[PDB]
Write a protein that binds this ligand. Structure first.
Ligand SMILES: Nc1ncnc2c1ncn2[C@@H]1O[C@H](COP(=O)(O)OP(=O)(O)NP(=O)(O)O)[C@@H](O)[C@H]1O
Ligand SMILES: Nc1ncnc2c1ncn2[C@@H]1O[C@H](COP(=O)(O)OP(=O)(O)NP(=O)(O)O)[C@@H](O)[C@H]1O
Ligand SMILES: O=C(C[C@H]1NCCC[C@@H]1O)Cn1cnc2cc(Br)c(Cl)cc2c1=O
Ligand SMILES: O=C(C[C@H]1NCCC[C@@H]1O)Cn1cnc2cc(Br)c(Cl)cc2c1=O
Ligand SMILES: [Zn+2]
Ligand SMILES: [Zn+2]
Lengths: 474, 471
């Protein structure tokens, strides 16, 4: 089978067939829960190892804290989306316990106990875990699940300056995970006061955007918590002159959401298209079997010494047409066809997945040439998704064009006053008129200028502080 | 602070002090749940990566299935020990859902759907996860916890031969994790009918033993499930001539218990002793000059060795010596003026207290080599202690005396279920219970075919079996 829904006009059906026929996902009989079959789980394992290697270079250490937390401890800080354990076997528990929705209330009482002097700082912890949250919005594979996988990092420092720089380091690593690994463009910025994590001072984030349906997605985040939680839990150290001070904290997380943004970004009407740095198989060799079976395996050896993941499909019970569609659906980058005249010429017929480009390549040039085609594919995918991200951002300086452009499926960049009240009104109005539009982020990179004391909010009557990105959110 | 309990006369207090002062573990306020701080989590990560690479050579693929299961699906195949979610926020759920205690009932309905033809076999799946089980027995860190981490492997094959080959391959990799990585001796064998996993036909395992308290522990396990589960869930394939048959299944798992067994095996009255293949830090460099410390260091990183300097002014050399000893660092380098003058390092070796002077010029070559020697020494001594703890008995008479010397018993046995049941009752009354641990693969001792009798029952013995008190 092939894909029978169109990406642009039947997106939901398209996304569903693509993740099921590729064997990325299976649907389960508890709503919002999804099985990650090997084909998608390989992508998560790759993300794990690249990010892990990065944080190790800034001395983050891995640990594992428990999945349960008591209500006493959870209700020190959100509650209707928490799952509670009340029973073991048939008999009621004397008091209920919560499955972990995040680890602050599990971890921080122990930070208080371990930290006594500036010499115990910095303290940098990370754990890879699963998380449960009882979502009220409708679920969607990867993007919004009841159980998801993530890492959560939690640091403590002696100055604000050192904590803020760790916030920024992590935010850059996250951007690199999306751009360099997943070939998915993202926009770095700061969250408005209405949209930030309420238990912290600042929240930075990366935003991405699915152009076929007009919706922004928050792709990862990184908080300067400051002294908010350190006062709340008693996290304090003796400085050099004997004086107790409250530590300056950060936290940050990234989830399997990443995998879904990537699929929705690169996929087409024939199936998955995958970045070669995360594709479980990059090259599949299909012979049209006598001296064929010797040339196939020579080609395999060559690619394997070179570091390329390659398989041969030499099954007798399938048409070459069937095979072509099977590996296309699974997003294999390169497809080598090997028949009689390919043997006769000592060369391989190549078809490139994302563009349908055909090429013949002598065998003695494979060692050099294939690694280099894979680097080109990786760069072409990021370059195209970025151009489409740019086509989707429209500058507006007043309210009158907004609704026209949200209905073309776009994001808005607009000068803005950043007040909470202003944001709440924008929301009410856009909803009424359509569905609501919210602030996504204030981009770190301001490609457009504020004339000092002349430029107005695009909505309120006040003066603008900066330009800000707005749109409808997944 | 150092260790103020004796391993032999105060084992419980000893084990607790060692894992807390080492900074491996922190106690938490829900019983049976323990935090794994980086010093112990590093050892789990190492286990993960070594086992992962091995199973990949036999084509096992990793996946991740959900944590929840419906009571409908769970009660197709152990009731009082499962944890139930009944509420989100303040509102009751329509129906309760179980946190995963094992994954058969989560995985196998999907195996039934994916498997149609012999061309879809073998199917080989592994997942790394956490598990919850509401234990009734008293908890102990690593050994028996409410939440634990593990891998669970689940396979399906078109013949029993191939499924059994896979059971044995896994059992050998588990033996190798304990022996080659953790320097901890284990005994391979087959579980008795009374002790095997009821859902399957055969269960193999490795058993460890802690000589200081006289108790066996089951270290990992591996089942030939045969066709029992395939019939229960409908896992069938068509052969080459169109005939439907039920697939032949295996499963196997290993948990964070491994870390506990290793700790209890090698640790002494000064603290952790760690196999160098899993020590988070292998060499600590302590100065009593700084160009010379950083030189030794560089030499050791190019060589592939995990090394740190402790150059803190506010602590005495004797405080540092204890600190890194408690934490089980293999090799301690002392660098004073005397040492600096001679272009040599004073070395102190953690398990034997042995002292050496090594020239800086010889470090590239000689430190790896010490670390291999230390790794082998640890396994060698634990093996000798395992042998002293195993006594041949041919009748019931010396059994109790032998259990009360903190030992295991190897004995001729008939292998009946009713025989084992009675052995349990009697040894309990008389002390608590002894049960069968395994029937070793390796049968040192010989059966007189026709003449040799059960040591307890009056029937004929099938072969020699290992019995003892279990953790
Ligand atoms: N249900 C979910 N499924 C998958 N990923 C999620 C889910 N909820 C949040 N995420 C991701 O987790 C990252 C950080 O989590 P967190 O900041 O706690 O989320 P949040 O505040 O609830 N934001 P959001 O869930 O997007 O409204 C987010 O930036 C999302 O990319
Ligand atoms: N509570 C626990 N905590 C940690 N590890 C455990 C626990 N229970 C079992 N294990 C380990 O998990 C492995 C797989 O065990 P499993 O198939 O569940 O058998 P079991 O009958 O539950 N074992 P046991 O707890 O010794 O009676 C065993 O070989 C044990 O080493
Ligand atoms: O989860 C967070 C804040 C941060 N925690 C560390 C990892 C990165 C993450 O952004 C915000 N958050 C999000 N969702 C939640 C859902 C529930 Br239910 C609860 Cl109780 C609490 C929360 C809650 O605190
Ligand atoms: O967990 C098992 C059998 C195997 N499952 C796959 C990994 C290896 C493991 O040995 C046996 N077992 C053990 N403990 C259990 C506890 C509960 Br509670 C339940 Cl419901 C079920 C079980 C249960 O089935
Ligand atoms: Zn305004
Ligand atoms: Zn008998």
């Amino acid at each position: 089978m092939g894909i029978t829904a169109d990406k642009i006009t039947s997106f939901a059906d398209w996304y569903s067939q693509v993740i099921v026929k590729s064997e990325m996902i299976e649907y389960y009989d508890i709503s919002g829960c999804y099985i990650l079959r090997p084909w998608s789980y390989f992508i998560w394992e790759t993300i794990q190892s690249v990010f892990d290697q990065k944080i190790k270079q800034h001395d983050v250490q891995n640990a594992y804290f428990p999945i349960f937390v008591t209500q006493k401890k959870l209700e020190t800080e959100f509650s209707p989306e928490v799952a509670w354990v009340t029973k073991s076997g048939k008999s009621d528990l004397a008091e209920p316990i919560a499955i972990r929705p995040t680890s602050e209330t599990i971890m921080y009482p122990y930070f208080a106990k371990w930290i006594r002097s500036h010499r115990d700082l910095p303290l940098k912890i990370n754990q890879w875990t699963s998380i449960v949250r009882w979502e009220f919005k409708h679920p969607t594979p990867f993007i919004r699940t009841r159980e998801f996988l993530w890492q959560e990092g939690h640091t403590a420092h002696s100055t604000r300056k050192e904590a803020l720089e760790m916030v920024d380091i992590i935010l850059n690593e996250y951007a690199s995970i999306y751009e360099d690994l997943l070939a998915t463009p993202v926009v770095k910025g700061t969250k408005s006061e209405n949209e930030k994590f309420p238990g912290g001072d600042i929240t930075k984030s990366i935003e991405g955007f699915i152009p076929e349906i007009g919706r922004a997605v928050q792709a990862a985040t990184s908080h300067l918590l400051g002294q908010n939680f350190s006062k709340m839990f008693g996290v304090e150290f003796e400085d050099e002159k004997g004086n107790k001070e409250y530590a300056h904290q950060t936290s940050w997380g990234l989830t399997t959401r990443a995998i879904g943004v990537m699929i929705m970004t690169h996929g087409d009407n024939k199936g998955l298209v995958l970045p070669p740095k995360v594709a479980p198989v990059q090259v599949i060799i299909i012979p049209i079997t006598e001296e064929q079976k010797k040339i196939c395996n020579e080609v395999e050896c060559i690619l394997k010494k070179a570091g390329v993941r390659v398989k041969i499909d030499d099954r007798s019970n399938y048409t070459p047409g069937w095979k072509y569609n099977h590996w296309e659906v699974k997003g294999v980058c390169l497809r080598f066809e090997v028949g009689p005249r390919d043997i006769e010429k000592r060369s391989v017929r190549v078809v490139v997945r994302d563009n349908m480009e055909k090429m013949d390549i002598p065998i003695s040039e494979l060692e050099s040439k294939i690694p280099k085609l894979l680097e080109e594919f990786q760069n072409r995918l990021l370059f195209k998704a970025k151009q489409r991200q740019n086509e989707s951002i429209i500058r507006v300086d007043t309210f009158d064009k907004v609704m026209d452009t949200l209905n073309q499926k776009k994001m808005v960049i607009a000068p803005w006053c950043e007040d909470v009240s202003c944001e709440e009104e924008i929301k009410k109005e856009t909803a009424r008129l359509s569905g609501a539009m919210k602030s996504l982020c204030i981009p770190n990179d301001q490609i457009f200028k504020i004339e000092e004391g002349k430029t107005k909010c695009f909505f309120c009557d006040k003066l603008a502080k900066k330009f800000t990105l707005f749109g409808r959110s997944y």
